[PDB]
Amino acid sequence: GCCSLPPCALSNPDYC
């Protein structure tokens, strides 16, 4: 999911 994908985690910091 998002939190294990660097580009996604970077854009969704509070979510992760």
DSSP string for 1-16 = -GGGSHHHHHH-TTT-
- Cβ contact 12:2 at 8 Å: yes
Residues 15, 2 contacting (CB under 8 angstroms): yes
**Alpha carbon 11 to chain centroid, angstroms:** 6
* Sequence-ordered list of residues with C-beta below 8 angstroms from that of 9, at least 6 positions apart, any chain: 2, 3, 16
- Stated in angstroms to one decimal place, the resolution of this structure is 1.1
